[PDB]
């Protein structure tokens, strides 16, 4: 099992804003609750 | 099992706004609740 | 099993707004509840 | 089993608004409930 | 089994509004309920 | 089994409004209920 | 089994309104209920 | 079995209103009920 | 078995109103009920 | 078995109103009931 | 001067196809030309 | 001068296809030209 | 001068397809040209 | 001069597809050109 | 001059697809050109 | 001059897809060009 | 001159996808060009 | 001149995806160019 | 001249993803170029 | 001239992801270039 978020190869990246990368491998849970 | 979010190859990327990448491999749950 | 979100090859990308990429491989659940 | 969201090859992309890409491979459920 | 969302080849894309791409491969369910 | 949403080849695309592409391959269900 | 939503070849596309493309390959159900 | 929604070849398309393309290949059901 | 919705070849299309294309290949059912 | 909805060849089309194209190939049923 | 497109009062509406409603109040012109 | 597109009062609406509502109040022009 | 697109009062709405509402009040022009 | 796009009052809305609302008040022009 | 896009009053809204609301008040122009 | 995009009053909103709201008050221009 | 994007009053909001709000008051221009 | 992006009053907000708010008051220009 | 990005009053906010707020008051320019 | 980014009054804020607030008052320029 291989998991790759972002890959660049001879490329140009310009990122001016906010960026979020969340990875779960296996048994991942992301619960959000607002009571 | 291979999972790839974004791939660039000899490319140009300009990203000025917000960006979110969430990966789940295996057994992933993303529950959202508002009671 | 291969899963690819976005691929660029000798391309030009300009992204000025918000962007969301969510990947589930295997057994993925995205429940949303509003009681 | 191969799954590809978006592919660019020697192309030009300009995306000014919001963009959502959600992928499920295998056994994916996206339930939305409003009680 | 191959699944392709959008493909560009030597093309020009300008997308100014909101865009949604949801892929299900295998056994996918998208239920929406409003009680 | 191959499934292709949209294909461009040496073409020009200008999309100013909202766009939705939903793909189901295999055993896909999209139920909508309003009780 | 091949399924193609929209194909462009050396063409010009201008789309100013809302657009929906839903594909089912295999065993697809789109039930809508209003009780 | 091949299924093609819309094809353009050296053509010009201008679409200003809403557009819906729904494809079913195999065993597709689109029931609508209003009780 | 081949099924083609609309084909353009060196043509000009201007579509200002709403447009619906629904394809069923194989065993397709479109029941509408109002009790 | 080939099924063609509409074909254009070096033609000019201007469509200002609503348009519906429904295709059934194989074993298609379109029942409408009002009890 | 009052102009009403469609009115429902304790009624049940099921609309499965495309629908277009265009209203002009005052001095409205809808010319269509194909030269 | 009052202009009303669609009105619902204690009613049930189920709309499964594409829908377009364009309103002009005052001095509205909707010309379409294909040269 | 009052302009109302759609009004709901104690009603139930289920809209599964694409929907477009464009309003012009005053001096509105919507020209479409394809040369 | 008052302009209202959509109004809900004690109502239930379920919208599963793409939706576009464009308002112009005063002196609004929406020209679309494809040369 | 008052302009209201969408209003909810004691209502329930469930929106699962893409949504676009563009407002112009005063002297607004939305030209789209594809040369 | 008052301009209101979306208003909620004692309401429930569930929005699962992409959403775009663009407001122009005064003298606003949104030109899109693809040469 | 008052401009309001979104207003909530004793309401419940659940937003799971991407969201874009752009406001221009006065003399605002949003040109997009792809040469 | 008052400009308000989003307002909450005794409300509940749950935002799980990316969000962008851009305000221009006075003389604002947002040009995007891709040569 | 007053400019307000987001306001909360006796409210509950839960923000799990990326968020961008850009304000320009006076004479603001946000040009993006990709040559 | 007053400029306010975010205001909280007797409120609860939970922010789990990345957040960006950029303010320009007077004569502000945010150019982004990728040659």
CA distance to D11, K1, P9, T19, per residue, from L4 (Å): 45, 11, 23, 42
What is the chain S residue with the closest CA to B19? S18
Cα gap G25→G11, rounded to integer Å: 27
Determined by: cryo-EM
Across the interface, of R3, R27, R31, the residue whose CB is closest to Q23 is R3
Q: A25: how many CB neighbours lie within 10 A of its CB?
A: 16
3 state SS of T1: coil
DSSP O2-34: EEEEEEEES-EEEE-S-EEEEEEEEEEE--EEE
Chain F's closest residue to M11, CA to CA, is F34
Q: Are S32 and B19 within 8 A, CB to CB?
A: no
- Give percent helix, percent strand, percent coil of chain S, each to the nearest 5: 0, 75, 25
Q: How far is CA Q10 from the centre of its chain?
A: 21
Q: How far apart are CA C4 and CA B2, in angstroms?
A: 9
Question: How far apart, in whole angstroms, are the C-alpha atoms of residue H26 and residue I3?
Answer: 13
Instruction: Say if CB O32 and CB P17 are below 8 A apart.
Output: no
Chain Q contact for D11, CB < 8 A? no
Smallest CA–CA separation between F28 and chain N, in Å?
16
With 0-12 / 13-18 / 19 or more C-beta atoms within 10 angstroms meaning exposed / middle / buried, residue T34 is middle
Report the alpha-carbon distance of residue G11 to residue I8 in Å, rounded. 10
3-state helix, strand, coil in chain T (%, to 5): 0, 75, 25
Contact between N19 and M17 under an 8 Å Cβ cutoff? The reply is no
Dihedral sign for Cα O20, T2, S14, D35, please. Answer: negative
Q: State the Cα–Cα distance between residues C15 and E14, nearest whole angstrom.
A: 10
Which strands, in side-by-side order, build the sheet including G32-34?
A32-34, B32-34, C32-34, D32-34, E32-34, F32-34, G32-34, H32-34, I32-34, J32-34
Hey, which residues does K29 pair with through a beta bridge? L29
Contact A17 S20 (CB under 8 A): yes
Q: Which helix (H) or strand (E) holds A27?
A: strand A19-29
Nearest neighbour of N13 by CB, restricted to O12, O28, O34: O12
Contact criterion met (CB < 8 Å) for E12 and P19: no
d(CA A12, CA Q33): 21
Instruction: Assess whether chains C and B touch, using the rule of 3 or more C-beta pairs within 8 angstroms.
Output: yes
How many pairs of residues across G and M have Cβ atoms under 8 Å apart?
A: 12
Burial zone of G18 (CB within 10 Å; 0-12 exposed, 13-18 middle, 19+ buried): buried
Joined tokens for residue E31? 């239920």
The separation between CA N2 and the C-alpha centre of its own chain, rounded to angstroms, equals: 14
Interface test with C, best of R13, R17, R21, R30 (most C CBs within 10 A): R17
Measured at the CA of L13, the angle between CA L12 and CA L19, to 5 degrees, comes to: 165
3-state helix, strand, coil in chain P (%, to 5): 0, 75, 25
Extract the tokens encoding N15.
Answer: 């919208």
Q: Which candidate from A4, A28, A33 shows the least CB-CB separation from B3? A: A4
Edge-to-edge strand list for the sheet holding B12-15: A12-15, B12-15, C12-15, D12-15, E12-15, F12-15, G12-15, H12-15, I12-15, J12-15
- Distance between terminal CA atoms of chain K? 37
CB-CB neighbours of T6 under 10 Å: 18
Neighbours of chain I (3+ CB pairs under 8 A): H, J, K, L, M
> Which structure tokens are listed for K35?
């030269």
How far apart are alpha carbons G34 and M13 in whole angstroms? 9
How many other CB atoms are there within 10 angstroms of residue K1's CB atom?
9
Residue T10 is given by DSSP the state S
């Amino acid at each position: 099992p291989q998991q790759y978020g972002i890959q660049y190869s001879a490329s140009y990246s310009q990122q001016t804003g906010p960026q979020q990368l969340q990875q779960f491998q296996g048994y991942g849970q992301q619960p959000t609750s607002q009571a």
